[model samples]
Target: GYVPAVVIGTGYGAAVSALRLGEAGVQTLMLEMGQLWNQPGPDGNIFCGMLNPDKRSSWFKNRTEAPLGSFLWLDVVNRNIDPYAGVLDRVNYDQMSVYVGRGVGGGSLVNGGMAVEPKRSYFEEILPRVDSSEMYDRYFPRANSMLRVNHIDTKWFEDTEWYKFARVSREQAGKAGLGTVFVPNVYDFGYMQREAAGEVPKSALATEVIYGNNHGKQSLDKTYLAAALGTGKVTIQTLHQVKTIRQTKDGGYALTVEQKDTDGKLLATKEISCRYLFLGAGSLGSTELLVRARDTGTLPNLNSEVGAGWGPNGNIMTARANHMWNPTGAHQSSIPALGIDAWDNSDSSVFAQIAPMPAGLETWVSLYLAITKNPQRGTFVYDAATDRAKLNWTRDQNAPAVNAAKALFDRINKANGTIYRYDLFGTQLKAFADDFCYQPLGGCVLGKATDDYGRVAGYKNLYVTDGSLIPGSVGVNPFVTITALAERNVERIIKQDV
Candidate 1:
């Protein structure tokens, strides 16, 4: 079937594109590889919690791949489960494996809901072609408002038992003379307060993050996609994965899409054509499509930059073993509300989220996922033998990230009299989980692979409107930036191209 516009993947960027296109009165179709996640399971829950998960937690994997693979050096976090088309997916490469959400909301379904705008200086440095004034004055606020980003009430945060972990981490950071800031999130803070007050069933307070948040979190599905549907010009097809893309004879785009069931059975393959194509299939999915198309001669005019500029946002995960006296609390909120704002450090800038260890027990640990200013970039090459895109990112490329994270944590540990948690990240000697990243950015960078407004250099109606447009690091959680960039680019595209 031919549609006027096709947006692949329902993440932040695609959702924005869909909603804006629909509002512009353009008929648009969105393709997603995972389920819609509106139905409840046998347990009457749409998503399973992180502590005890089943097939509903993973994407077509027999075993559950929890981020915290081990606790106290024991393989107790993951379980052997049946393979199903679940919500969270761990895409494993040689040296790095990226964790991405598979369902309609994409990474929003599994992330901590931290909707942070990048530091203005850093944002400007990353993409100089973008108008910083316009972004700060217009798009960032627009994205935040659209995504329903809210801040936790400081009084509630200080008084609530669920946020004790955040308070503890804040104290530890303060002791080290490091500043801590409250991060805004898409999770409904009022609903979280209600959950804490026992007025509503718990979701964030119930450790219902990462795997999937059954409530509270305002993922893209509930916001932009809902508005897109309201416009009556946007339709979504779940479990339809786009395999290849090429220009049709009539000067339009043709996508080779495969429809699959939850059990991983191929139902049918179809060629869907569209006048305008928006690639928001995440950093991996979208970049892979362009790489394959270029390498396979399907889109031979694609620039060589299509497969370059890949990065993992300089992600470094590490945990600090606090003193037994400083218990991180039994009741921990899954949503992270505080962060160690060390981005201004001279040696290596880093912004560390004060994450939770919701083991349903007092683990006396302060975990963090640090975003650092690393200059290393990865390249993606199409592997024709396996027909996959291989990211050539070495493990050593993360040294700067680890060093930056270590520089900040070392001060905190010294000030608070704590040590590193060697038992949390699967390996006894590995204190940093640099192998996996929750925020994967770039591959088809803005102004390099595409024009300033994310228009592909060699194509007229093809747009790169996802995290792939960001070079590598955004000095914070990349979603808000991705959303704002999509809004900016799409507004320009609609004005000029459409």
Candidate 2:
């Protein structure tokens, strides 16, 4: 099959690209590795929560892999389930693991609904070639509007039982002389308020995050992809994974895509061609595709920067035990509303998000996922043995991130007289869970791997419009940034190339 444009992965960047391309009257096709999640399971719901997971919670695994590894140092968080093509996936390297989402909506299907833009100073510092003024003035607002990014009602937040954990953390931060800022999100706060009023089925209030949200979350499929489909020129194919890419004799690109079933059964191996190709398969997905092509000589003219400048966005998760008198309540909202703002700190900048632990019981714990500013970066090397990309990063490189988080929490603990929880993450009593990450940025960086507009330097009509453009860290939740960058890059591509 031949199309004018093809987008890989239906994530933030890809969603924006598809919509703008279709709006410009271009015929486009999107390929996703996971199934389209439109049907309900035997439980009569599209998704299951973290508390009681089933086969629908994992990605082709015999057991569920919850990020919060344990409770009370016991392996009670995970459960054995039948292998299926589920929503969330944890791509494990030798020393690091990255969590991503599958299905039609990509990571948006399984992420905390925090739609934060990076601090402009940090964004400029990371990608110096990008015109920050244009981004801040033009593209950022477009991305935020199309993403349906909104804020929680402060009146509802301060009084709701679901947000007691956030209030508890805010109160402790106040004691530490730090201030709390309200973080905007893509979740519909009105729907959440209705859920709290018992007028709607509870999703955010029911602990339906991380795996996939059954409601409230404005995932790309509902926003950009739906708008793209409205143009009548864009279509999506589920369970079709692009295996390899090479330039055809006619100056077009040929893709060998493997179509599979939900049970991991191969259905067909097909060949598709496109005049223009956009790689939006995220940091890991997009980087590996280009790395494999360059290493295997499929695209020999590709530059060396295709797999460099990768980082984990300095992600570290930790939990603190609060005083028994300060209970975080039994029911909690899955969407985070506040952040511990320490980004201006010169020595160690950490923006920690207050997370919810909806255990259905009063648990005196304050969990946080901190995004620190670290200068360390990693590279991806393609391994021919398994046809995969391996991340060359050691745990020592994340030491600075941990130290930054420790600096913030140490102050909070000292002021509030609270202690770190050693029982949540694992058997080891380490306070920081520094091994895994949620936001994996970089690889095929802008102005380095590609041009300032994300066009491949040596190739024509090929572009990258995903998290791969950012150089490692954005100092906040990165989807909004990724969306804006794609908006900035693709608008130029459509004007010039397409």
Candidate 3:
């Protein structure tokens, strides 16, 4: 059967589009390759715990694929579990690995939920075609409000046991003369406070992140997608993986989808048609789909820029060891609520989030996920032999990011008289893990591969509205930008094109 509109993924962009299209009285269908979250499993839990991951933690993989390669050079970190459709996926490339969410909320399910707005000057510089003033004045605020983004209470943050690690990191960065800033999050701080006070069931306070949150987090499924369903014009079908897209004789699009069982077995192959197509499969998934179609003659007119300008958002994960006297608390929350902003350092653009080390023990380790301004970009090429997309990113291309992070961390360490943690990341001499990224951005870039509002240049009524639209890094957490851009584009589309 055919639909009025089809949104290819249930990410931030897809959720926004689904809600808006449904509210506009248009029939919309959202296809997701992952399962719907927040439903109780046979074990009576909504999500698998990161500390003891099960089959529900990986995407049809026998072992959990965490971003951290290993713990202390022992393979004990990854335990074998039965293959199933899980929440997180680690897509491996030639030299880098990318961690992304697999469920209805996309990255919101696994990410730390840092709802950040890029600096207007930097955003305008990066996306020259987008109206920065309009975004700041309207769409950003609108998206934030819809996403339920809020900050931790300052008084509570200062006195809470959950944020002691963040305070320690902030104090150390301040001693190094680096300015720190509060990063807003979608996780409800009031609920978290209740969790800490023994009045509610714990999720963030219980080290629940990177797998899924049981409660207190406003993921997209709970906000946008929930509202989309409530509109009565939107329907979602899970485990429908779109393998190919081609133009029909009547100028519409046909999608070849593989419906899979929970064990990753193919249940059926089906075809769906739509007049309007939205690609929200994220940077990697959307880029792969478009590149495959372009190379295989399904959409030959797709531009050469289809799979270019991909970056890791300058993501570098590392840990620093503190003095014995300065102890980060044994009890810590997995949600990050602050960031060390060193963008004005004149050396490099680096904003580092002080991540939690919820090991249930004080190992004197302070973890960080530093987002830097690296000028490197990668391209995706379709490998006809394997019928897969290959990324041309190399390890050397990430050196600038590593250097930028080390520059800031080195100063912080020197100022605080501490050193790098050596035991957390596979017994490396240093604590840096620059080979992987949890924030993938770019590919099918806006204004280069598509028009300013994400309209595909060579196609009518086709659009992209995800991390793939940004040309390289955004210098902050990307979901908020993706949501705002979708809001901007879908508003114009509904008003003009629809």
TM-score of model 3 relative to the true fold? 0.97
| 324-351 per-residue lDDT for model 3 (tens digits) | 8778888889899889987752338898
What candidate 2 gets wrong by more than 4 Å, as runs, is: 69-77, 345-347
Tens-digit per-residue lDDT, 1-498, candidate 1: 999999999998999999999999999999999999899997899999877778999988998755563355223667898889999888999999998999898998899899999889888788888889999999999999999999999999999888888888888889989889989999999999999889998999987898888899999889999999999999999999999999999889999999999999999999999999999999999999999999999998999899899889889999888888788888889899999888862448889998887677777888898999889999999999999999999999999889988988999999988899876775558889888888999999999999999999899999989999989888899999999999999999998988
**Cand. 3 Cα-lDDT:** 0.88
Query: What tens-digit string does per-residue lDDT give for candidate 2 at 366-451?
Result: 99999998888999999999999999999999999999999999999999989999867766788998889899999999988899
- Model 3 residue 19 lDDT score: 96
TM-score, cand. 1: 0.98
For model 3, the run of ten residues with the poorest summed lDDT: 66-75
Candidate 3 runs further than 4 Å off: 65-77, 345-347
Deviating ranges (above 4 Å) for candidate 1: 69-77, 345-347
